[PDB]
Design a protein around this ligand. Sequence first.
Ligand code: CLA
Ligand code: CLA
Ligand code: CLA
Ligand code: CLA
Ligand SMILES: CC(/C=C/C=C(C)/C=C/[C@@]12O[C@]1(C)C[C@@H](O)CC2(C)C)=C\C=C\C=C(C)\C=C\C=C(C)\C=C\[C@@]12O[C@]1(C)C[C@@H](O)CC2(C)C
Ligand SMILES: CC(/C=C/C=C(C)/C=C/[C@@]12O[C@]1(C)C[C@@H](O)CC2(C)C)=C\C=C\C=C(C)\C=C\C=C(C)\C=C\[C@@]12O[C@]1(C)C[C@@H](O)CC2(C)C
Ligand SMILES: CC1=C(C/C=C(\C)CCC[C@H](C)CCC[C@H](C)CCCC(C)C)C(=O)c2ccccc2C1=O
Ligand code: SF4
Lengths: 739, 169, 41, 160, 168, 80
Amino acid sequence: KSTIVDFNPVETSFEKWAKPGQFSRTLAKGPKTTTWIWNLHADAHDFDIQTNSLQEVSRKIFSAHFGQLAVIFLWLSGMHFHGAYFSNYSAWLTNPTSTKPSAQIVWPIVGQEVLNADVGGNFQGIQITSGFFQLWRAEGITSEVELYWTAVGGLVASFLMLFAGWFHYHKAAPKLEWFQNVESMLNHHLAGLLGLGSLSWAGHQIHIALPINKLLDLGVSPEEIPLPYEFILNRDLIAQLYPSFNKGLTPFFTLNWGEYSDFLTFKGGLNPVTGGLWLTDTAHHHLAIAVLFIVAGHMYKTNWFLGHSIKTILEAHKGPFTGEGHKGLYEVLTTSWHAQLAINLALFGSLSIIVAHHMYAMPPYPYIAIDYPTQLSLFTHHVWIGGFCIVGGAAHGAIFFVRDYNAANNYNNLIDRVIRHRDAIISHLNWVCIFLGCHSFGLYVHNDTMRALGRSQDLFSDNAIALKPIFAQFIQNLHTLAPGSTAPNALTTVSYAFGGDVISVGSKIAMMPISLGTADFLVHHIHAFTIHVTVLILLKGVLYSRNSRLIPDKANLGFRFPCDGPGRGGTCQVSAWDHVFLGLFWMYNSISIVIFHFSWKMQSDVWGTVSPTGAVSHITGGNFAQSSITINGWLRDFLWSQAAQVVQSYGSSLSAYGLIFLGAHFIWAFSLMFLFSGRGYWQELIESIVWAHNKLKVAPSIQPRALSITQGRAVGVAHYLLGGIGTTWAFFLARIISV
Amino acid sequence: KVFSKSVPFLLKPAGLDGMVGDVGFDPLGFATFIDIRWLREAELKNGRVAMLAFLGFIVQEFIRLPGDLYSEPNGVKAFFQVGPQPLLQIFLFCGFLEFNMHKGKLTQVDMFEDGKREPGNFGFDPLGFGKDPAKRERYALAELKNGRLAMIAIGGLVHHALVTGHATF
Amino acid sequence: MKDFLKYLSTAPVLLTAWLTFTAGFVIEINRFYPDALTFPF
Amino acid sequence: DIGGLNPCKDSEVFQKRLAKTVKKLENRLKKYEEGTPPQIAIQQQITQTKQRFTRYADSNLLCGNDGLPHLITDGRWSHGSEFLLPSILFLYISGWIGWVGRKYIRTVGQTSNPTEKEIIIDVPLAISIMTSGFLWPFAAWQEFLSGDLIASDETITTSP
Amino acid sequence: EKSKAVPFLPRPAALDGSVVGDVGFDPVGFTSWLPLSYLQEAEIKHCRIAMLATLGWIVADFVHLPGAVHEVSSLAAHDVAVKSGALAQILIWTSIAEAISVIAISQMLEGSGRQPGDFKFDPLNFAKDEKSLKKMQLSELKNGRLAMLAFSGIVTQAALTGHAFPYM
Amino acid sequence: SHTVKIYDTCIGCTQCVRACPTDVLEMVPWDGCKAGQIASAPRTEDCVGCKRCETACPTDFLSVRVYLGGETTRSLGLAY
Ligand code: CLA
Ligand code: CLA
Ligand code: CLA
Ligand code: CLA
Ligand SMILES: CC(/C=C/C=C(C)/C=C/[C@@]12O[C@]1(C)C[C@@H](O)CC2(C)C)=C\C=C\C=C(C)\C=C\C=C(C)\C=C\[C@@]12O[C@]1(C)C[C@@H](O)CC2(C)C
Ligand SMILES: CC(/C=C/C=C(C)/C=C/[C@@]12O[C@]1(C)C[C@@H](O)CC2(C)C)=C\C=C\C=C(C)\C=C\C=C(C)\C=C\[C@@]12O[C@]1(C)C[C@@H](O)CC2(C)C
Ligand SMILES: CC1=C(C/C=C(\C)CCC[C@H](C)CCC[C@H](C)CCCC(C)C)C(=O)c2ccccc2C1=O
Ligand code: SF4
């Protein structure tokens, strides 16, 4: 009878497994039409409509989190197992600059063995662009046995998380008060999870990754490198590489932290041997992060007369312009899972995009900057994940507004005041979007039409009307001057992208000053415009989710509904879901432009080879500066030019990329059937098909119905995203692996 | 609880009661989700085919027919040397037999739909063995046991020919 | 094991098992007799 | 011969294709070492390529001017193994599938809960029906004769 | 209260007295969330398997079957037997026995009355009444636990030091 | 303004009237059904055409039918 958990709440039985739709009150009666099948999967994780108790929803969410973490652990275990058994990691360790990472071999069936490429190191397989080899090398993993043991540990951890989810749904489910301890949860997630994870990783780096990687960079082969445990039992194997361990932990406890400058450095730049960040800098960074997060975890009052109450902090932040201020926000975020999901997903996607930027900007792994496929894939993948997560955060903000928003509890607070002037916000955001689009894109079109008319001096180019990004160049200058002036204890700039020397590893450029000209001005304003339009769609969905001048009772129709009818001139897509659908489209557009800008700019003005005398030759040859300013330039010198490797991949080991290119084109075009058409035509065609089936006595008892309007839109957008992202995926991968 | 006589640590399977080979052997409960009459018909036919095929092995390796085609002591290699023409005639003759012996109703859903069909009872008894009902049950049990033994032995002989290649001897 | 067998009798599990078996015997036919453009006979 | 094509056994471009593929595979084989699994895999690729080309040559296959086997599907039994025999095989298999599906639909359509037995299949009855589809050509031309294959006027029709 | 084995720990609350080899040893409470019959069946299966395994390991390091394939130590016999297909036959027949076991354990858990580990295999008697059966069940459990620990030690020592039957 | 017609298949279940967002339909006495009531459309000038009325109709092919016609600031749902 614990005060935090309920014991044996749900019986572990297979009876409900044999009753599909048991969770829903409407679906429990059984299918009558094929719409029931689709409704079954669309409501599976909508725990809000399955129970009327916040406690039950919270417990379901907790167990679902455990299942998700078990799935993630299984995926990581699979990655490590493939590295251990079906990879050339050992060969890549001895030749990182000449062996391509491969960790998946393809069975010899139907002639598909051509996919096993010549990745080097007496190996055949698919080249890997996830950068696991570089990460494992940065971890100090020098043998495939360690990868096998990490895979075994991942399997054990996945089983543990599965057992935890089962235990906390069926044997000991926490109570609502336990879930609502946001102060305790924040304290623990900030100190324990974040800070202690940073501290543990700093310890691992210092004791395992720092010596092993230093020996690897010195040229010591992985076979004669001591086993990682020997660096702990023997204080002399690590004190030779870093002659500060001879003093032990006495400098730490005597506040003489200057003695540890051997392995806790602040250098900046990149390791000249590997092209990645100095691992001493990384260990010092993780140590500082650990201390900062542990300190930050002692902020909120949990169980003693010590710390802050988030309710008292929010309620004190009022103002003349904001009425009641943040009063009621604590109740909103402690009684609505959707609001927490909105905030967490938005910040999580933004964090993913920031991670993507800082990855290539400052390569943190050895021999990852010179693996161009890995860098391109990591950036594009993380930016895509960030965009999807941001759209999801907007969607769940809209869901909270529709479902969990209480008008009485939010009288004259920030949420109320935002809804009260939603018109002004949306109208000014509309004006900003029109201004930004007009300018950015019409400058592009003006360049295109001036070039087409033979007026080269009328373009918005560097040798013409020039739009120099002076503000960004000022920041670039400030960073390259930071070491010794504003960061006096730095030896080198944080990233060579801001300026400095060309860093090359094995005649391949790792990082180099990224010059910003009029071409970068236009593409940056294109980014701003696309982001603003996506924000416009999502914010219009969130703010007008409850009511509008069209439908004053839109909240009574729910978050997900197709329309209110053909009246009022037509009330299609007025939902808030139909705004997360359009916003998904615009996020695809924005992220596609972002990754295109990254790919072309890097290939044209960063990546390449360096001659022995210091001459820099890039992959494309600097065509970004003069040919990325017109739409015809993007079509020809980027799309047409770099699509050559994809279309000429047939018969080679990259033929799978051409096949996926074609299939993604097919899927993207397939989406337009659902996006352009309507439900009535398909229902009436199914009518004649059903007539034929009845004529042959083969009409199913479950009456076949065309997909609902909302499901038709969902299928269309899912296929559109899959096709477009897969086309860009195949194009990028084939292009950057070939060259 | 009764518990099976064959598998003594398992409960007695259902649906086998009035049969001529009941020793309570059905751990997987195949008689619960498959018609017992169809199962006995299939067991009897498989057994009879296996008995004929085992006798065919032993005779083929010994006697054989005159001709270049019929000159392989190994049954597995004889299946290939004989060619498709003699085998397809056997296939068509067996099909004709199947059609005429079951009188049209050949499938799992069609056979035993009207009942009045003892499993495995084609009425084939020209030599008259089986007029006395006292020995009829013993003959049925002997046929079942010989059929099962011949299924095991037919598999054994076929796989011996595959792993060695010469003959059975 | 009365409701577990009923769960295995659901449409998704049965379709997954049948399609896995189908792809399996197709792939194995194409392994043992590869590159079959015409009928073997 | 038929349509101006020539047998692949006498098509020079066919042998040129075989030689070029084998040469590419051998050049790939040259860059690996000893009896290592990559060399074994490439050698198996070469052997399979040679076997496939030899089988296509000795298969009554007509090759065009590009040295690729062309299919003669006008209906002649001479090239009957290209389309006609696979056509019969597919017709048998697909008729089997359709027949067992229709039989299952009509069988569980006369029970108390027909819709339940469509998401939760009656595996015993399903297995019973599925193995009975080998007689689908005979069953179809025994149910059409009895009028049990086609509905007449209980089928629904739209307003016009 | 105050289980017999660990006198300072409470009784596991699922093992009162009515099981052979029940000294109340369950400190981590495995019986609190798993069926007792299931755990008993697993323990008895482990006991029998490890008894056979210990005897086989010790004997095969002394006596070898005729043939060159059977001329390896028990430590290296796994990779040789799997290649020759010797372990494939054992796998096939063990899988058959274990499918019948799936049926048996399911029936035992859903009623029936079959005691855990009771396959009724008893050609000789060796157990005529309840008392003899209980004593022999206790002997089987104790010998099986001892053999499980013994096989564990044998394998660990042989892997550590590639020695013959004395694995010291 | 749109046109709304009521047909004698009306069962007087009132679901159309309580679904109209602009108070177009009302229940009036009748003798053609058990409930003794039939829907009426006396305020079609306020009809917006959202067709919520016939989404709540349980009769087989509807008893209230909305025919979209000429547009008005009331029928277009214009707050401006
Ligand atoms: C220092 C203590 C601590 C630590 C380390 C964590 C760590 C975590 N919590 Mg958590 N939590 C804590 C205290 C702590 N919590 C307290 C005091 C409360 C009550 C207010 C909660 C309430 C809470 C909820 C409601 C949820 C989490 C979730 C999570 C996970 C976030 C997912 C993630 O980042 O993946 C990082 C993953 C890893 C690093 C993998 C290794 C982590 C393992 C599992 C250690 C977990 C520590 C655990 C608390 C120890 C208890 C053991 C048990 C025998 C008592 C993460 C594993 C979320 C989640 O995913 O649910 C499962 C979630 O929904 N926590
Ligand atoms: C942490 C992440 C997270 C979480 C927990 C949720 C959770 C939820 N969301 Mg949500 N969402 C997210 C991210 C997340 N979402 C993101 C990133 C987006 C932007 C795309 C959305 C957009 C969104 C909408 C628009 C809606 C939800 C809804 C819901 C609720 C019901 C979900 C459900 O039943 O789906 C069950 C799961 C499915 C139906 C799976 C569908 C399969 C997907 C679409 C295809 C995946 C393809 C995959 C990549 C493989 C393709 C490869 C190909 C080759 C085969 C639930 C509370 C719905 C709701 O009513 O909320 C109350 C709703 O209307 N969400
Ligand atoms: C190439 C196709 C295309 C184009 C041009 C646009 C253009 C636009 N969309 Mg978009 N959209 C598209 C495809 C496209 N969309 C698709 C496929 C979808 C489906 C998901 C959407 C969904 C969508 C939504 C949901 C929203 C937009 C919005 C916008 C507008 C953003 C404001 C802006 O930049 O206006 C400026 C106009 C342009 C940049 C177009 C070119 C104008 C030129 C360059 C300058 C002026 C030329 C001059 C006047 C010509 C005069 C001569 C002539 C008379 C002969 C803009 C009109 C948002 C909106 O309403 O605006 C705020 C919005 O909310 N779109
Ligand atoms: C866990 C049980 C087990 C397992 C997995 C093995 C496995 C192995 N033994 Mg072994 N063995 C066992 C028990 C076991 N033994 C016992 C109990 C004895 C004592 C009689 C022996 C005596 C023995 C000898 C003398 C030799 C092996 C050898 C070998 C290796 C290859 C040949 C072979 O399978 O043995 C063949 C096994 C036998 C000839 C005797 C087995 C007698 C069985 C175990 C007792 C009856 C149990 C019953 C049949 C259970 C029915 C199972 C049920 C599912 C139907 C192989 C690694 C050979 C080798 O290569 O040595 C390195 C070898 O020369 N074993
Ligand atoms: C004998 C047998 C079963 C016999 C049972 C008999 C007779 C008794 C039956 C009856 O009493 C019952 C039960 C009940 C009665 O009402 C009926 C009768 C009839 C009275 C099964 C054999 C079963 C035999 C089996 C399973 C053999 C498997 C062999 C394998 C797998 C060999 C593999 C290899 O050869 C390869 C493939 C390649 C090599 O290089 C490597 C290896 C590994 C050696
Ligand atoms: C495995 C097997 C039987 C296994 C039996 C087992 C395990 C029995 C175990 C038990 O009994 C015991 C031990 C004790 C009992 O108390 C309990 C049980 C449990 C009941 C039979 C295989 C039986 C296998 C059989 C019958 C295979 C026959 C194959 C034929 C005819 C092949 C013909 C071809 O191969 C050629 C010739 C040329 C090819 O190219 C074309 C074709 C046509 C494919
Ligand atoms: C075609 C179409 C239908 C009909 C589509 C239906 C009935 C979907 C049928 C799906 C089948 C029955 C199952 C899926 C079969 C696929 C082969 C499985 C997917 C492939 C896997 C690899 C995922 C609509 O209902 C519809 C509604 C609104 C707007 C546009 C449309 C629309 O375009
Ligand atoms: S059906 Fe399509 S068009 Fe007709 S109302 Fe609903 S959404 Fe608007």
